Every structure is written in structure tokens, then in C-alpha cells.
Amino acid sequence: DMVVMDDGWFGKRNDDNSSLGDWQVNETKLGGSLAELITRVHEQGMKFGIWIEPEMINEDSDLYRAHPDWAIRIQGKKPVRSRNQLLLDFSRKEVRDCVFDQICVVLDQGKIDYVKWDMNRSMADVYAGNLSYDYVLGVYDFMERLCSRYPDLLLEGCSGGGGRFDAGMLYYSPQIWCSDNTDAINRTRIQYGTSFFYPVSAMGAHVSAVPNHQTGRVTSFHTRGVTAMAGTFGYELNPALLSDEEKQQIREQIKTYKKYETLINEGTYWRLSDPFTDEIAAWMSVSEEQDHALVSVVRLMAEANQATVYVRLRGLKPDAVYLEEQSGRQYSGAALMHAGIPLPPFTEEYEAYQFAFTEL
Amino acid sequence: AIIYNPNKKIFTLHTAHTTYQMQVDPLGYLLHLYYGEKTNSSMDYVLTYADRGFSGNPYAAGMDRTYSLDALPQEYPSLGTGDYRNIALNIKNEKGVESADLLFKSYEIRNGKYRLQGLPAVWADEKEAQTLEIVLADENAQVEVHLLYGVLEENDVITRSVRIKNTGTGQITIEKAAAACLDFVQGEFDVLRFYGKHAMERNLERTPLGHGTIAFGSRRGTSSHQYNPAVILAEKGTTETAGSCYGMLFVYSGNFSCEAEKDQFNQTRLLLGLNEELFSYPLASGETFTVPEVILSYSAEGLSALSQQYHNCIRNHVCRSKYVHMQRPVLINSWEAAYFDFTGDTIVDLAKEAASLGIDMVVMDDGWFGKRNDDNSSLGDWQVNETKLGGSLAELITRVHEQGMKFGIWIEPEMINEDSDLYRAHPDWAIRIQGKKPVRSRNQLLLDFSRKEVRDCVFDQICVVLDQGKIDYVKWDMNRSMADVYAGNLSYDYVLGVYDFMERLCSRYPDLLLEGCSGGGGRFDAGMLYYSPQIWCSDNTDAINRTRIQYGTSFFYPVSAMGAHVSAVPNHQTGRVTSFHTRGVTAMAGTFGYELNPALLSDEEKQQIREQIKTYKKYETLINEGTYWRLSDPFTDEIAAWMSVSEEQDHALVSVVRLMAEANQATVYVRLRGLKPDAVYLEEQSGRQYSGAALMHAGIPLPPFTEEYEAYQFAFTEL
Amino acid sequence: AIIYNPNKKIFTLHTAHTTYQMQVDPLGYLLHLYYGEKTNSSMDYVLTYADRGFSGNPYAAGMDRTYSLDALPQEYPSLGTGDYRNIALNIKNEKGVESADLLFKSYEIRNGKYRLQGLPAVWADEKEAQTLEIVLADENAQVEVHLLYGVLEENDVITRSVRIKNTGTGQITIEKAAAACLDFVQGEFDVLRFYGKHAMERNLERTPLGHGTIAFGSRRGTSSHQYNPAVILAEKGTTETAGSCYGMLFVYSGNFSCEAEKDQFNQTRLLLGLNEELFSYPLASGETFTVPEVILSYSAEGLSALSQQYHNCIRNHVCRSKYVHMQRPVLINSWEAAYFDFTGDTIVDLAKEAASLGIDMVVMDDGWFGKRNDDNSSLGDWQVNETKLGGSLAELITRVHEQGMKFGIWIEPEMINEDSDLYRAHPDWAIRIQGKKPVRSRNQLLLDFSRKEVRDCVFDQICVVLDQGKIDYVKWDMNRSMADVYAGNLSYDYVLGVYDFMERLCSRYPDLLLEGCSGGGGRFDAGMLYYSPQIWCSDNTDAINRTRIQYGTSFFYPVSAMGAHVSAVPNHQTGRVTSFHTRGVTAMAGTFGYELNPALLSDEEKQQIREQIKTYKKYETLINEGTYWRLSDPFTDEIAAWMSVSEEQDHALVSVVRLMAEANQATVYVRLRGLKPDAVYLEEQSGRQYSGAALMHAGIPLPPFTEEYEAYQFAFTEL
Ligand SMILES: [Mg+2]
Ligand SMILES: [Mg+2]
Ligand SMILES: [Mg+2]
Ligand SMILES: [Mg+2]
């Protein structure tokens, strides 16, 4: 439905060594204006989103050459650098206003339905005892102003992934990029842990390419899909490099996610296994009336002469009868919660499954 | 309820809250599908099939390598199917071949609860219970196996037994016969068992079930002090108040074996039944053998509910004594009080002393017969020692009655001393191996109770004694294990003989309160509780140790069944001192009673006895009939705490014994269980009022202690 | 050293670092005093005596109630002494009585190491070893029991065996016969056992020993995939590098039972020997039965030293093959490469391919005989299929030799298919019960190897095949478990027959390298290693699973004994992909070799094979003869890591396979073991130098991974 132009579109940002603070569109790189680009994307039937990182500045920027004192620093002391950048002092209204105005100019160029607001280093060189608190007041002030000015905007929070995955951010953003790790197997653990307090709907999760860019591990396209559906869903790869079979998987994945989107986002969530200890990462979502459930399973361990693994369900009505969709078999809730269902035997590593149940 | 689906060949057993399901497969094997929370589903979908290396296939499976009884879950697995796990049945046929490969023949569903030939068993009426009897057979072994399932819906109990018939012409031997098998295709479990020794029975051992077998049993001829014939298979993480757990309890007072095994495919098999050791039981053409019963139960909500299910089953469907529903006389027992050093006069003095304190009965323990002035003679010579008693037993009973007291007596009918008239007359009546000098234990031998002539002699002697006067109580003891076992039928037939004698005794004397005993709790089992409403729980009467023994005993057995007496200090078994009050609180978790000479006590301790008896009698119905809750684990916690709650949840008695003492004590809270959350309860002594929710979530703070091993009782009444 | 003190009647066995001591008590019972760290003391002071309820007394103890074989520690406890624990010996006498009550008769100390009739056993010379033979007897059972202790000082090994003689006139049956018993009067222990399944053998299970028994065994007719006949009793807290631990290893390829029990008095009894199931062994007047040997060992300094003691004992005192001290040809095996779909031409193509890579030998696996084009026919028909081979076996061998390659062949002599000429001629040669259709597994049956006529037929056929040319290697497989066991002597006599055939084969062909096999590691035991210097460790050739299988196998068995091959991916058993390099590193922890068609590989993978072979040959002596160290636990850790160290500690090869992968990886260090702390070591590839102390305390950081399941080898040389 949507393309998100991530980092690299502003200033002379052709790597991560310059340009934060210079939120002017790089029209050379974009081959024209941002307004024209948005229209070209709309003409393909697609919505548009964009990445920003308003709290930050690179020494190599016009903003820093003009206002080096706007960076958080201690007088006389050379500051810590992280990702070759510095924090802007968001405790200062003048600093925030400058950046807010620049971002407004960008967002006013066209219909931008989505913004990913990132933040890629920790605060250092803290110069006074009020700064940590007042900095965050400034962040929230900017965020409130942004959301008020653009009330139809979907704002995805981000901080090198889940570096500010907290309920404070969720007040403004209905989703937060859960992790820069898009390895499906690692994501089972990250998403498991995140679920102890935070709803599935809040977890940004995308199908990415393999070998995975963070781990080097290969996983099947199907397993990536099942794991990323425990969240926002979405893609973060160039589909032109995929096989026709994987392109068709994307078509079917989107249909599946859209079919179950309300159930995944609004349903009661249940962890069905502990991926730190168990043979599988398994979870499920159950409708409020307990008349529909989607069960997801990723296998984590493989040996020869495999034992039968059962997934035991939770949160169903014990006396109700449930139809499993693909197989057409019927089970009582009690059966499904006490004995569970046997998983089909695996033939490859890290295999995944989804089972849908409907109350009869 | 018991249902048969003929098309799927599925048998379903439903209790109020549980379902057990089995299936006859297309080859005729009786597979186990499910046991757990109540369900109307067909659970055959849980069965899976793969070609698993070295798990081989019945000939009848043809080319299907995915069908193996070394993998599939079974009701009654046997040696001779290709199954390599621990098995329930081994038959050695008339040609020497050890094989049994059992296929379905027929079934019947009947209202009511089956009975067992010559054995105790659960009983119920035709409305309360149903029975499923499944017949399987092996035509090559020429054996026919009748599996019996008893379903007691309200109690959430399923019983199992087995009858094995030789259908061939030559003799077979039964080499292993379990009563029950539970096969789990999945699950991580712990095994709870109850181990100990003489004078320290039924300690709880709970460990994870690792790959391999956890096993325990008895070949002592008795259920034993060392390992009780009981097991809980608890799902990992199960607590007193949550999680799945399964019990098996053997309704049997002889040898047994329990095996729990986690296999190559992460499956679990649990077996309970007869020991295969010293068990090679001959069965002639056309004859039937009966395996003693196992009581199974399941709880989805923790160990406390499982125990409560057993308590109710035992009180209302095992114990046949009228005293289950009657006040039981508070007794004083002469054993720790006097040992062998008493006369008739000192028994009457004990009666006088006890009468003045509100005690109801004196029990003349060991030392009254033959020339039994120590434990080195006279077992088998059950003639009253009138020299020692200063007259006849009839006269003694009358003298005790004249003090306002009932009379009880100790017997040990299964035993003989070399130094006895009986042994000088009949040395061959002792269990022994020809040509071999026998093991002695307590300087005595077992009588061969497999022999009618032996039993009849002793039964007649005991009848003469019991017919001398009004004896309201008998303590039947048994003070050593069986050795010199001379044949493969002896262990089983010995116990048939014990039960026959016990049945005859109880039938002849139906108003008798029979307390079972075996050096304390050496046969503390449901087999004995069929005849006796109480069993002497342990020879250890140390209050602190008793907290552990009574705790362990409560996992399967009701408080009402636990013989418990206030004894003297320093304790005769441990040398430890405890307060009189603490001894009283601990002994009230059972039968109550005394076993000391009250003449040696201070007036303050005599007054404590008066008040203790009033307290026990006030709470006797609550303690005996109420729902029992363990409130702490005395192996790990600061306190041993328990409580009993009325059926309507309108009354509760809470008991606490402190186990640990340090300076600057932290506040210890006792958290209650089993109350109505929204009800308001009045604590009697203090007059304070609390909601059930408060009492169960926060509990109550114990008063600070000022001495070691202090105890408390709190009574709560619903307003 | 072996010493007798006649006055105290104490026998002491000393190894270099351990002492084992026993005593004949005044009643004639052989008590166990001690096993542990070396001591010159008389350890009889550890024995204590109390009147323990229900622990009874030999008649000969008279009035002394404090003397009981239900409490005392014993060398060889038996059913019939009053002992109620698990026992080592049960004899059923000529009158049907199960009893053995063994008293000391005599002894002898001999230089050298006893041998066992028809069985493998540890061997050594008269300077390296001494033997103690103690004779006990029971005059009522009419049995005489000879306990054999073998002491190998330098190896810190004590072996045990037993010979049982019927001294009466009528037949007796041996119903249980363990080889070894260790009784501990005190100590808290864990039990380590090695469990699994086909294609996943010898997983480590370590659990505390709770009250009751932990037991495991095999009645499969084989030592088995499911439970290896090996146990470690580790004192609580023992690690790889510290603390007391005890091993028992059964030198036997048939049925067994292991029992570890923590008793009522907190004592521990450990037993290992024959299974009592399907074991009722007849012994005529004057005849002797031999129990297979157990190798015991003790380490005061952890599990790694214990394993090293076993490795050395097996390599130098069990394995008789010349290949223990020789280069072994690097082979390629046709099974995963081609299964049944090959011809003579495609075997020669495999030889050509393999020769160009530096492989030394081609092994023609299953599919060459009868009409064996699948696993549904032809076992028993050991005639070359010359149609399939496109000519004779002699011609094929020559064609392979012409490619510069040695030749090996697979056999499965113990087995028969219904679809065979042999079965059509001799259906009664299969193990079966008359009138009963037998279990089938892999659609085949066992031949009755207890019968000489059966063995001779098959032995003659195999000789014809092996005499066709220069065959340097035989893989002897065995692909199902025994069922339909028709008599109580069969399990034992079957295995005698296997060993007889194996001995005849090895004697006829003394230059043959015999690799044992049983669906992989289904008979991975020291009994087989007496004949074979290597055993196919598992049919699972997945490198990641192999890390666990090889880890578990190393607890008792040397690396040199572990058959291990580089196979294709996706792996045929798991479907998992691993790099060619990782497969190579993992398979070098064993025999090495290949089992794939190299024609399907990329040129880069072919060049890896060339370099792998050069690496393995460079390190072959170090891997096979060096001291082995487990450096991680693959069940719990981030890596599977191990190393081998030369005797002089001047050379080491370290191997690592990563098991877990996440983003932003932490630095993982591999800590080495078994080096000289003050020596300086050069790491070859990097050229960096480290002290042994540094390498053992800090270790070395692994290079960061860029792909999953990456592996490493590091070589260190002392400067
Ligand atoms: Mg038996
Ligand atoms: Mg047993
Ligand atoms: Mg036997
Ligand atoms: Mg056994």
C-alpha cells in the first residue's frame, strides 16, 4: 500500500557522516522535487512515507557550521561522537523551532501519510542536572506539535530500532520499530519479550531479505512472513531481486495479514511457549468473543527422527467446538488447551505454521 | 459416565471434571488417547505415526513401518508386542515363553462398582459409579486379560484393576502384573514419592523426571515404611494450588512396584502395581488371578485438590468402619507409658488417671500374653498372662469399666517367636526355606499366613481373648518384613491370608474399631484402610518430626486415618523436648490420644490434657470431615501449617507449629486456603473479623514467639 | 597392587591414584569399605551398626539386632540375605527357591589380567595388571560365585566380572546377575546417563539422585541407541575439572540394566550388569556362567580426567586392532551417496572422483548382494549381484585398485528377510516363537545366532565374498532390535554367537579393519571395540547434531572410535544446511571420511576436500592419540568446542562450532585445557604466542561470525 523513503533523502546525506540538521530535500538525488516524487508514487497507486531524525546534528552540516553551540556539549570539552553525530539541545525552544519549521516545509510538500521518527545515539556530555528531563520535555513538545499539526499522520517511533520502545512514545505513535534486527529467529525472542507489556499492534515488524543483514542467517520466506505478522507487518527489501515464487508469497502474505489484521491487532494475545527454552516460538491471538483464533508457530530446533511436538492453545472456550480452517478438522476448546495439536513433521530448518480456528 | 463409540472403537470415561479416553485400533490394540480436563472431543487425533528407527511393527501391520507399540500409547502394554519400554504385563506360558500380545475381544459397561475376590477395593452404589470391563486376549500365550475401570463421577476418581485367566491346558506363571498404566505422548513432569524408614515415614521427594526411569517399590511382603505405594506425576510447574497432576494409589498392603519413565521420543509412561520380584504366580488351566486395584485421579488445579479427591474417596468409598461417621473414643495407650513393665493394677491406675482427665479408653498394648515380658518370646502364644495381670482379662476389663473407661488391646497375629509354645509345637508354621536358617528381625519370624491351618489356629486364640469382655478397640501390629521367601506365590497368597483373617475378624466383631499398625506406618495403605478407619502413623511421636510425617501422609490419606498421640518428653525416639501445647496441636491432626503415664505430669500439664480433649472433641467433626489444606512445606518453610474447612466453608481450624527460631524475628504470616472470598469470618479467641479474600491473600500475622517450637490454633466462623 | 590383610580380612586394590577396599566380616559376608582417593588406611572404621527398624539380621548374628545386610555396604549383594535394596544376584535353585546368601570361601591374587570365556574383556600383561579372584558360596542354593577384580594401576582402572557355578545336582537358573556394585555409606550424587534414539544417540542426562532408583537398560538384544551401558555417579558439585566421580562401563553388546538408588539411610547403591528381563539362564550341575565385565574408574578431579582414563583403557587395553597405532585410510562410503541405486560402473566412478581428491578407499555399502535393490529382500543371500555390479566382485575390486583405491564392503550377517532364498529354505532359522507371527522391523527378522548351524552358513558365505579380492575394510551392520524371544537363555547365547562369529572373522582376516555398526551407534560399546577400532557413531551426519552425539560419546569412548563422515546438504536426516567447512571440522572429531557423491560438488568444495584430507592426515596422530578435552557443553553453550593435546603437551588442536547467532554479537572466548601453564605456545595461522596459563584462564577470542554455524580450528605448538 505504501513506500517509505528512509534515511538518505536530505542535505547531502549519501552516508551517515553528514547532513543531520539540514532537512532540505536533496533534489539532485531525487531527480526533482519531493512534491513531484510523491505524485509519481501516487500515480503508481501508492501512499508515501518519510524518515526523519530531528533531535540530531552532524558536524558536517550547514546547521552545525552556523550553530555549533546548539549541540549538547560541555564548554571546553570535546564531545563523545556516536554514529559520527551529536544531539541537538532539545531543551532549547530556539533549537526545536528551527528544526520543526524545516520538517513542516518537507511535510507540506505533498500527501505524506506516514513519518518514521528515528533517533540514533545516546545522550552524553550532559552539562547540567536539569538537562535529561528538560530535553525529553522538548522532545514531547515537538512530538505533540507535530501530531496536532498533522492529525492524520501515522507516526512510527524509532530509535535504532527499539531504543525508546516505551509507553511514553506510544501515546504519540501507534507503532514503534521493534528492532533493527529483522532476523526472523531473533525476532521471535525480541517480540516475545516485547509482549510482556506491549501490544502486538505496537510492534513494527518487516519481512527482510536473506542472508539476513544483521546475522548472516538464512530463513525461509514463509517463516519471515509468519514472524513479521506478529506486529505491523510490512516489507524492507527490493522485491525486484526475488523469485516469482517469493513474489507470489508476498501477494498471499498480504492477503493473509489483511484477513487477520483485526484479530492480530485487537485480539487477546497469548504466549504459548518460551523461545529461550522450548522447541518452538508459538503465540496466538483470540477474538474478544473467543470465536476466532490465529495460532503461529516457528520451530527453533532440529534433530533427526523428530519427536512429535504439540502446540497447546490458550484462551478459548472449553466447551465450544472450533473448526481448523485448512484441515477442516473440529476440536473442542478443552482438547485444544489440554492436548493441543500435533505440528506437521518438519522437513527443513526453522519451519513455521499458522493455524486458524473458527467457533462452530 | 462411560460411553462406547462403536465406529471409532473409542471408550470414554467421564467424571464430574475429568475425561479419560481409550481406543481399539484397527489391529486390535487398546491404545490410550487422553486423561485430563473434561472434553467431548474424540482425542484420537493426538496419535501420530512415523518410521522410527528400531521401533518395529506387528506382523499384522504388514509393510507399514510407521506403526509400533514401541512408540504408541497403551492402556496395558506388555512384554511381547515389540514395545521396549517398561511394561505392565509379563506372562510365561506353558512352554516357558515370556510373551503376551493382547488384542481386543469384547467389553461390557455395568452400573455400579466392581468388587475384587479376596481383596479390598473402592466401593460405591449403582447410581454413584459405573464399571467398564474390557476383555483382551493372546491366543498363543493362551491368556485372557480383563481390564476393569471404575468411574466415580462426583469424586473425580477412576479405578483400575485386572483379572488374568489361563485359557490353555498347561500351567502359566504371571511374572509381572501392573494394575494401571498412563501413557503420555507429551509433557514435562516431576515425580512425587513418599520415602522413609522405620520411625520416619513418607518424606516427600519431588524431582524432575529425567530420561530413564524413576522407580521404587517393596519386596518386604508389606507396602512398607520405605516407599509408600503411591505416586504423583505433576506437570512441571504444578503447585499446591495450580497446574495438572495425576495420582496413582495402590489399594494394597503387600509388595509393589512403581515405574515412571521418560522415553526416547520424550513420552512418559507411569506404571503402578505388583512387584515383579518374588512374583512368579502359578495359574492352572481355567483359573483367574486378580491384580489389586489402583485409584487414579487428576487435578487441573494443583496438588491440594488432588489430595482432597483422595481423602474423600478413602473416607466415603474405601473405609467400611462405622467410625468414619461417629465420634471415636479418646484413648491412652500403655506402650510408651509402661512398655512391658506393667501389671493389671498399673493398667487400672492408668484408667483412673485417664478417667480424671476426660480420656475415654485405655489400650493395653504389647506385653499381656504368654510370658511376654520383653520382645524375645511369646508371639503365637495368645493366652492371657494372668500372673502379670493379677487375674483374668475379664476381671481387668470390668475393673477398667468401673473407672468409666473403655478397653482396647494389641495383637500381632502374623508373627511367632522361636521361644513360644506355638513354635515348639509347629516350627514348620514359620515362613522359612528348608535347610536354611532364617533371617530374624526383632528376634521373631513370620507365620505362613498363606496356610489356612496356621491362620485358623491364631484366629481361634484371638477370638477367645476378644470374647472375654467388651473390647471396643484392637490395635493389630506387624513388626518385621518378610524374608526367606520360599516360592513365587507366597508374597501374594500371604497377603490374601492376612485380608481373609482381617475380614473374618471385622465380620465377627462389627462394632470393633480396628487400628492398623506395622511398627507405625509400615502398612499405611488404602488396603488396610478398607478394614481400619485409622492406622498408627509412626512410632515416631516427636511433634516436630510428626509435622513432616503427617504432611507427607496427607498427600493421599485423610487426617482421620492418621493415628497420632501426645507422648512424653524428652521424646523416646529423638531425645528432643517440645512443649505440651505443641504436642497437643500436632496430635490433633489425626486421631488424637495419649501415650504416656499422666501420673508423672504436673498439675498444669494435667489441666492442659483436660483442655486439649475438650478442644479436640469440639473440633472432631471439622478435623475428620473437613476439607484439608497444607499451608506450608515443613521441609523448607519457617512453619508447619495446615487447616481444615467445613463443607459449607463456614468454619475452619488453622494449626501452626513454628520450626525455626532466630533473634529479632521477622513477622511470619500464615496464608489460609479454601474459604469463600467475600464471606466475613470471625476469629474466635481474638474476636477480629476478616474477609476470606484477606485471609487467603495476606493471611494473618502469627504472634511473636518467645520459646522454640511454639504452636497455635486459630478458629474461624463465618458471620 | 593387590594386598590381603589376613587378620582384618581386608583386601585392598591400589591403582596409581585410587584405592578400593573390601572386607570379609566375622559372619563371612564380603563388605565394601571404600573407593576413592589413594590411602594406606584400614577403612573398616567407616562401618557403623544400629538397631534399625525392620532391617533384620542373619540367623548367625544371633541376638545382635544391629547387624543387617539391609544396611551394610556390600561387594555383591543378593536376593536372600534380608537386604531389601536393589541387588546384584538372584539364583532360582533346583527346587524353585529364589535365594542366594553368599559367604566367603577363599581367594587368590594373580599377576596379570583375567580373560573371559567367549567374551571381550580388558587385557594387559603380567606387569601392568593383577587379578583378585574371591570365591563365595551358598550351600543351600548350591551356588559358588567367583568375583573377579582386575587392577590396572597406571590407568586408574578396576575391572569386575563374575563366574557363577552350580555345585548341586539339579539345574538352577540365573535370574539376575550384575557385574559390579558400589555401595556408598554417604554422599549426595548426580547420575549421568546417555540416552537417545536412532539417529540421535547418547544425549547427556544429568540429574540429582533422589530417594528411590534411577534405572535404565536394554532388552533389545543389543546395548542400544536408547541407553548406553555406561553410567557416571558424580558427587554433587562435580564439574569437568573438579570433584569426585565414579564410572561404570559394561564391556558388552547385549542386554543390560543399570540401577542407582538412594536409600532409607541416605546411602547409595550403584549396579551395572545384565538385564534381569528375558534372562533366566539355565545352569546344569557343575556348569559355570560368566557375567560380562564392567570397567570401573574414579577421578578426584572431575569428569574430564575420568573420561581420559576410559579413553586410554579402551585404546590400549580393549581394542585389539592393529589400526589403533596406524594411519587409517580416509574412506568414501556409498550409502548416502547412492543408497541402493548404483552399479559397478558408478562405484568405479566414485573411486575415480575420490582418488582425484586424496581419498584412500571406497566402501560399497548396502545393495550389492542377492537382489538387494531396496531394503525389502535378500538379507541372508550373501551372493554377489553380478548383474548389478556388471561383472564379478573380484573384477570390481581390481578396477577400484586400478584407480589407486582400497576397497571396503558392508555386511549384515545377523539378519534375514522373508524374501530371500535363505528364508525360503530355512524359515526356522529366524528368531521366532512357534505359532506366533513375528515382529518385523525394517521388514526383516533376526537369525538365531545362538545356533552354530545358522552362524556357520552365514560365515561361509561371507568368507567366499571376502576371499574374492583384497578387501581392507568391512562395515558390519545390524538394523533392528531382537523380539519374539523364545527362551530365557536366548539373549545371552545370541550375543555369544555374535562374538564367536566376530572372533572367527577377525582371526581369519587379521589385517581387516572392521567398523562396527548398528543403524549407527546402536551397539556403541566396549564389547564391540574389542573387535573394531571404530564404530559408526550415528546415522545422523548433520554436523550440528553430531556435535551433541560426539560430545556424549566422548564421556567414555575415545575420539578414535567414532566413525564420522562429511555428508551432503541439505542433510538427509534433518533437512538442515551447514557449510562444507563446518561439516569437515565436526567429522575430524573421529575417523573422518566422506559419504556423498563428489561429482555433485563445486570445484571450491572439491578443493576443500583436498585441504581437509591434508589437515586430517597432518593431525591424525594428535586427534587419535592425544588427550581429549570437552571445552563446552553443546546443550547449553554458544559453541561446541573440544581439543586434543599431545602426551608431552607440546601440541594441541582446538575445534569450535558456533551454535547460536544473534545481531551485535558478543565476543565469545574459547578457554583451553590440559596445557602446561608456564609454557609458551605458538598459534599457527596467526603466528601469535600465548602462555598455557593465559590460554586456560582467559582463552582466545573467536573471530566474529558472518554466517550461521561457523567453525574454527586452531593449532598450537610449544616454543
Ligand atoms: Mg516375576
Ligand atoms: Mg523392578
Ligand atoms: Mg530374570
Ligand atoms: Mg529392571
Side-chain angles (χ1 to χ4, degrees), chain B residues 175-176 276-277 279-280:
Chain B
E175 295 294 342
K176 187 179 186 182
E276 79 285 350
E277 304 178 342
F279 181 70
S280 291

Side-chain angles (χ1 to χ4, degrees), chain C residues 164-463:
Chain C
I164 301 157
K165 182 174 173 178
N166 182 359
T167 62
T169 42
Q171 181 189 272
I172 66 179
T173 50
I174 308 172
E175 295 294 342
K176 187 179 186 182
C181 179
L182 280 179
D183 270 330
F184 296 91
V185 291
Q186 61 82 28
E188 297 296 299
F189 298 101
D190 294 344
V191 178
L192 292 69
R193 64 279 196 182
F194 299 87
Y195 75 89
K197 60 190 169 182
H198 175 258
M200 200 74 195
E201 299 92 328
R202 291 175 298 281
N203 300 292
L204 172 63
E205 183 72 284
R206 180 173 176 171
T207 70
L209 178 61
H211 285 270
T213 298
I214 292 170
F216 54 91
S218 173
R219 66 167 188 274
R220 286 172 180 261
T222 61
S223 60
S224 84
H225 303 86
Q226 290 70 27
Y227 297 103
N228 198 256
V231 64
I232 301 164
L233 191 73
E235 187 160 34
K236 179 177 177 165
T238 289
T239 64
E240 287 286 359
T241 55
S244 289
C245 48
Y246 299 83
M248 293 185 176
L249 185 65
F250 203 21
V251 187
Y252 192 58
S253 313
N255 286 347
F256 79 98
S257 177
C258 181
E259 298 158 297
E261 183 185 26
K262 180 181 188 190
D263 82 3
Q264 64 175 321
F265 310 128
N266 301 330
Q267 305 182 120
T268 304
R269 174 168 290 177
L270 181 63
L271 292 159
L272 185 63
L274 291 164
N275 201 334
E276 79 285 350
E277 304 178 342
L278 299 170
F279 181 70
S280 291
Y281 198 92
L283 207 54
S285 181
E287 294 184 339
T288 298
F289 175 84
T290 300
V291 181
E293 178 173 82
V294 162
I295 306 172
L296 299 91
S297 194
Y298 168 75
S299 175
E301 65 196 31
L303 300 164
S304 290
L306 189 67
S307 297
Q308 290 155 11
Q309 289 160 194
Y310 280 100
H311 301 170
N312 200 290
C313 186
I314 292 167
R315 286 183 45 79
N316 298 312
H317 294 288
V318 177
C319 298
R320 296 173 305 160
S321 177
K322 70 172 187 176
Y323 283 101
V324 174
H325 308 286
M326 285 182 63
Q327 185 168 37
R328 306 192 196 175
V330 171
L331 70 83
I332 190 163
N333 179 287
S334 70
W335 177 245
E336 299 192 15
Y339 293 101
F340 296 99
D341 184 11
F342 63 93
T343 63
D345 284 341
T346 70
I347 297 293
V348 178
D349 290 337
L350 196 58
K352 286 173 169 167
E353 287 288 348
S356 72
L357 303 167
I359 295 167
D360 298 308
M361 175 163 63
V362 61
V363 179
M364 180 168 67
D365 205 270
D366 190 358
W368 59 266
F369 53 98
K371 56 144 177 160
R372 186 83 165 171
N373 288 307
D374 71 5
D375 66 358
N376 289 303
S377 77
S378 300
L379 292 167
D381 291 348
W382 300 103
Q383 301 88 27
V384 175
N385 184 347
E386 301 188 356
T387 301
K388 185 172 188 170
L389 298 192
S392 74
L393 179 61
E395 176 181 302
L396 179 60
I397 299 168
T398 297
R399 290 175 64 198
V400 169
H401 168 86
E402 285 168 355
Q403 299 304 326
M405 295 295 275
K406 287 170 172 178
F407 198 93
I409 197 164
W410 175 105
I411 63 167
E412 189 176 352
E414 296 155 75
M415 300 286 178
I416 191 169
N417 290 107
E418 289 164 292
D419 188 4
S420 67
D421 291 340
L422 192 63
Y423 186 91
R424 284 181 287 273
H426 300 286
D428 68 290
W429 285 13
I431 292 177
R432 61 202 309 151
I433 288 160
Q434 175 83 23
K436 182 190 172 298
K437 294 175 183 171
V439 166
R440 290 185 288 199
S441 190
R442 209 192 186 180
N443 201 24
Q444 71 196 57
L445 301 169
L446 276 67
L447 284 171
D448 188 354
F449 262 45
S450 78
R451 290 170 61 187
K452 184 173 187 291
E453 55 267 32
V454 175
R455 300 196 309 275
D456 286 350
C457 171
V458 177
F459 187 79
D460 287 355
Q461 295 189 59
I462 295 306
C463 290

Side-chain angles (χ1 to χ4, degrees), chain A residues 9-25:
Chain A
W9 59 266
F10 53 98
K12 56 144 177 160
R13 186 83 165 171
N14 288 307
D15 71 5
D16 66 358
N17 289 303
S18 77
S19 300
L20 292 167
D22 291 348
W23 300 103
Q24 301 88 27
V25 175

Side-chain angles (χ1 to χ4, degrees), chain A residues 181 186 214-218 302-307 346-350, chain C residues 197-200 540 545 573-576 661-663 705-709:
Chain A
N181 190 333
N186 292 162
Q214 305 88 40
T215 69
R217 170 169 31 233
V218 175
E303 72 194 0
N305 189 15
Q306 67 193 269
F346 68 85
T347 60
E348 65 187 48
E349 198 175 17
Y350 305 129
Chain C
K197 60 190 169 182
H198 175 258
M200 200 74 195
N540 190 333
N545 292 162
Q573 305 88 40
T574 69
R576 170 169 31 233
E662 72 194 0
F705 68 85
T706 60
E707 65 187 48
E708 198 175 17
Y709 305 129

Side-chain angles (χ1 to χ4, degrees), chain C residues 330-332 357-360 543 564-567 578-596 598 601 604-620 623 653 711 713:
Chain C
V330 171
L331 70 83
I332 190 163
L357 303 167
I359 295 167
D360 298 308
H565 305 157
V566 174
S567 59
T578 62
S579 68
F580 204 83
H581 181 251
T582 292
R583 281 169 277 158
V585 169
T586 306
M588 286 188 208
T591 64
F592 203 53
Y594 294 87
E595 187 163 334
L596 46 68
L601 302 173
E604 193 276 330
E605 287 180 352
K606 294 180 180 172
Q607 190 56 36
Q608 285 199 57
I609 290 179
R610 294 193 187 87
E611 294 301 334
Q612 285 175 355
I613 294 176
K614 292 176 186 175
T615 296
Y616 184 73
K617 288 178 181 281
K618 173 174 183 182
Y619 295 107
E620 184 173 359
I623 293 165
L653 181 71
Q713 285 166 324

Side-chain angles (χ1 to χ4, degrees), chain C residues 35-240:
Chain C
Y35 185 26
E37 297 173 288
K38 201 156 180 179
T39 179
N40 294 305
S41 298
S42 297
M43 303 304 293
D44 54 319
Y45 77 88
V46 310
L47 304 171
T48 67
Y49 310 90
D51 183 346
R52 302 186 171 278
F54 292 66
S55 289
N57 316 118
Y59 201 89
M63 301 300 115
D64 179 13
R65 300 189 188 170
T66 75
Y67 186 100
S68 180
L69 292 311
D70 189 52
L72 290 163
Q74 289 160 76
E75 288 301 316
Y76 204 62
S78 60
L79 191 164
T81 61
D83 189 358
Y84 295 111
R85 291 171 282 190
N86 298 326
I87 50 63
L89 186 70
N90 185 24
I91 297 296
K92 188 181 292 185
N93 80 357
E94 78 168 280
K95 293 142 182 209
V97 175
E98 299 181 90
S99 193
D101 187 4
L102 304 173
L103 303 176
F104 177 84
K105 299 312 284 174
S106 64
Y107 83 97
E108 187 189 9
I109 298 167
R110 296 188 290 273
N111 290 323
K113 171 55 173 60
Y114 65 85
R115 63 183 187 186
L116 296 185
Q117 170 180 113
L119 296 161
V122 167
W123 46 268
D125 76 24
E126 291 187 356
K127 302 93 182 164
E128 289 175 320
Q130 288 179 287
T131 293
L132 170 64
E133 178 170 352
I134 291 171
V135 185
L136 316 172
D138 176 341
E139 177 180 299
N140 300 126
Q142 299 194 87
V143 66
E144 180 181 279
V145 175
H146 297 238
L147 300 179
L148 294 159
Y149 300 79
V151 180
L152 276 68
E153 280 186 0
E154 181 167 351
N155 223 133
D156 285 311
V157 154
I158 295 171
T159 68
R160 286 189 63 182
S161 181
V162 187
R163 296 176 183 138
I164 301 157
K165 182 174 173 178
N166 182 359
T167 62
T169 42
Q171 181 189 272
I172 66 179
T173 50
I174 308 172
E175 295 294 342
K176 187 179 186 182
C181 179
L182 280 179
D183 270 330
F184 296 91
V185 291
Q186 61 82 28
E188 297 296 299
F189 298 101
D190 294 344
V191 178
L192 292 69
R193 64 279 196 182
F194 299 87
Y195 75 89
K197 60 190 169 182
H198 175 258
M200 200 74 195
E201 299 92 328
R202 291 175 298 281
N203 300 292
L204 172 63
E205 183 72 284
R206 180 173 176 171
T207 70
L209 178 61
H211 285 270
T213 298
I214 292 170
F216 54 91
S218 173
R219 66 167 188 274
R220 286 172 180 261
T222 61
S223 60
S224 84
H225 303 86
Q226 290 70 27
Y227 297 103
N228 198 256
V231 64
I232 301 164
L233 191 73
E235 187 160 34
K236 179 177 177 165
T238 289
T239 64
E240 287 286 359

